[PDB]
Amino acid sequence: HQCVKLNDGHFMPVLGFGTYAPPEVPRSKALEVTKLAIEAGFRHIDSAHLYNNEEQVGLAIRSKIADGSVKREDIFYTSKLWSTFHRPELVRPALENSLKKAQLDYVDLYLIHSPMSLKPGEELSPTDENGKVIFDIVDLCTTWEAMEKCKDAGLAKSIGVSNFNRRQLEMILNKPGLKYKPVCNQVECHPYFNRSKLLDFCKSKDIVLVAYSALGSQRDKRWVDPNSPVLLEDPVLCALAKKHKRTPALIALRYQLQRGVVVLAKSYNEQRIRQNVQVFEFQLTAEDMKAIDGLDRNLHYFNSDSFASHPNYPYS
Ligand SMILES: NC(=O)c1ccc[n+]([C@@H]2O[C@H](COP(=O)([O-])OP(=O)(O)OC[C@H]3O[C@@H](n4cnc5c(N)ncnc54)[C@H](OP(=O)(O)O)[C@@H]3O)[C@@H](O)[C@H]2O)c1
Ligand SMILES: O=C(O)C1(c2ccc(-c3cc(Cl)cc(Cl)c3)c(F)c2)CC1
């Protein structure tokens, strides 16, 4: 039930529910499982305009609020500005549109989803006559300024970023007249890509690293190489799981918590959802932690093939 204090004074629960499902998963499932996650103890819910599920996620919270299970102030709710909305004048309207879909007065946290700005307009993934995604050039410091206006108007209690590397964080950090540092940076983080260098950097700046694909990602065929290793079949995680008689997933989650990383976990399965809350019931030894440290293989599960050429692609 622990939270971590953010550098603007707000608190964030260290365990979060990921809500993204691919589009073939029907939208009514996001409503169901967000309800199950709250019943199970999740209070930190991660969504995004890209996910096409914020209305369902908002309806889940409203329902659990109306049945007396939680109050609005107990729920930590996250959304993200998609990359077609980086131009500063589009940021407050994008946030306001998310608030209307979810039917909430504020978000607990608003993020820049990705630093790879994209052609503004209505399509989430605008593409040219030759199938290429269409980039756009935007000064992210102006985007950030508009983010800061959103906190001031109280529509976002906290603001942060996602998928930034060190050079992009410093750019916000070294901004003349910077009012609010980012509270966090949400990045792909798991034993095969542990981001120890970035984590050390964010720790020195009082910026929380938040892990996604902490369980090795959904291995979606649009993005993930089928030949890539399966995180949860890893013999060291499996050996550790038997020792504590937990599960591999639970080893992977506990690893992030003990190194001070806030960890997300997606599951659309009732039983696995309730299992993940058990991450608070045990602890790994310092030597288990070193063993997991040695799995790092610089492996990004997400294959960028029209994105590697983006000037702001963060694995450059
Ligand atoms: N900011 C970004 O760019 C970004 C990028 C990616 C993701 N995210 C967010 O963070 C979340 C990241 O997670 P992810 O979507 O990449 O998937 P993930 O958390 O890495 O999970 C991958 C798979 O593990 C399964 N799983 C969950 N619990 C399990 C358990 N106890 N035992 C065995 N398997 C289990 C799930 O399958 P089942 O559903 O069948 O249980 C899930 O599909 C996303 O949902 C999204 O909210 C953000
Ligand atoms: O859950 C998410 O946020 C998704 C996602 C997954 C990955 C990315 C992403 C991938 C690469 Cl290779 C690079 C960057 Cl900056 C973001 C992204 F922008 C969005 C699956 C929709």
Side-chain angles (χ1 to χ4, degrees), residues 1-121 123-128 130-302 307-316:
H1 188 23
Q2 310 121 38
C3 291
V4 60
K5 189 215 278 182
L6 311 177
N7 60 38
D8 69 354
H10 290 123
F11 295 78
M12 177 199 287
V14 301
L15 175 56
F17 184 61
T19 58
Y20 181 77
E24 58 273 32
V25 167
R27 303 293 92 182
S28 44
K29 276 302 280 185
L31 162 69
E32 191 139 42
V33 304
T34 301
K35 276 189 262 182
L36 304 171
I38 291 166
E39 307 182 6
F42 281 87
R43 297 296 176 265
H44 173 166
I45 303 187
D46 185 81
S47 185
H49 175 57
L50 170 71
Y51 299 171
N52 189 27
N53 72 9
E54 283 184 290
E55 178 170 34
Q56 287 78 50
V57 171
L59 277 148
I61 291 158
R62 208 224 78 90
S63 153
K64 284 330 261 195
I65 277 169
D67 82 359
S69 284
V70 291
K71 276 173 199 133
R72 177 60 190 94
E73 59 264 33
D74 309 319
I75 293 284
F76 188 103
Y77 174 86
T78 301
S79 188
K80 308 179 176 98
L81 177 95
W82 186 231
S83 313
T84 52
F85 301 100
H86 279 190
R87 292 202 184 177
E89 74 271 16
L90 308 178
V91 169
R92 186 171 179 161
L95 171 49
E96 290 190 312
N97 172 72
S98 271
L99 288 165
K100 174 54 85 183
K101 309 233 70 161
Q103 329 207 119
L104 303 172
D105 317 295
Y106 62 91
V107 289
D108 297 278
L109 174 67
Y110 202 46
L111 302 178
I112 296 169
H113 208 137
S114 151
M116 313 183 286
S117 301
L118 294 176
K119 169 188 181 62
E123 276 154 294
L124 305 177
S125 158
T127 173
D128 67 7
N130 304 345
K132 318 280 225 333
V133 170
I134 293 171
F135 310 161
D136 181 31
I137 308 190
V138 178
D139 173 293
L140 291 180
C141 286
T142 74
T143 304
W144 191 250
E145 290 152 27
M147 293 294 276
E148 291 169 327
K149 99 205 158 176
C150 285
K151 178 175 156 82
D152 273 334
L155 304 171
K157 312 236 149 224
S158 287
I159 54 180
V161 309
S162 177
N163 294 298
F164 279 36
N165 65 28
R166 187 200 292 236
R167 178 181 171 172
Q168 291 149 344
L169 281 172
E170 275 155 2
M171 178 249 273
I172 299 308
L173 294 173
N174 301 321
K175 188 216 154 216
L178 175 73
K179 205 159 143 166
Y180 307 116
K181 305 159 77 175
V183 304
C184 84
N185 186 14
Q186 183 187 128
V187 303
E188 174 174 359
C189 185
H190 46 72
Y192 284 170
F193 194 28
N194 70 36
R195 325 297 308 270
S196 39
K197 266 136 182 90
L198 189 69
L199 175 55
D200 277 319
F201 176 84
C202 288
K203 281 171 165 166
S204 77
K205 305 286 178 173
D206 194 13
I207 292 176
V208 162
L209 199 152
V210 179
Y212 68 71
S213 296
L215 304 177
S217 98
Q218 299 191 40
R219 308 189 57 90
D220 192 306
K221 263 304 302 160
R222 305 171 280 167
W223 307 302
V224 176
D225 188 347
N227 313 64
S228 79
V230 183
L231 180 73
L232 300 176
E233 299 173 356
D234 179 80
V236 169
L237 300 161
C238 291
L240 284 173
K242 78 172 155 27
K243 185 156 90 149
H244 302 265
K245 213 86 219 65
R246 301 298 171 145
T247 68
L250 279 168
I251 311 291
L253 296 189
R254 186 78 205 176
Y255 169 61
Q256 302 293 15
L257 292 195
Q258 277 180 212
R259 63 209 295 264
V261 163
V262 164
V263 74
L264 299 185
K266 173 258 175 187
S267 166
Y268 272 34
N269 178 278
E270 208 215 5
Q271 287 317 287
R272 268 116 53 181
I273 291 162
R274 294 174 67 89
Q275 182 194 115
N276 298 336
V277 181
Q278 303 175 315
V279 68
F280 299 98
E281 297 181 350
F282 70 101
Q283 338 167 316
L284 295 153
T285 76
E287 183 86 339
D288 303 328
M289 292 293 283
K290 291 153 181 273
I292 301 160
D293 284 330
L295 297 174
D296 190 285
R297 56 208 69 202
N298 199 53
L299 193 280
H300 330 316
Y301 277 112
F302 294 85
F307 296 145
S309 46
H310 203 294
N312 273 332
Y313 179 73
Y315 304 140
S316 82

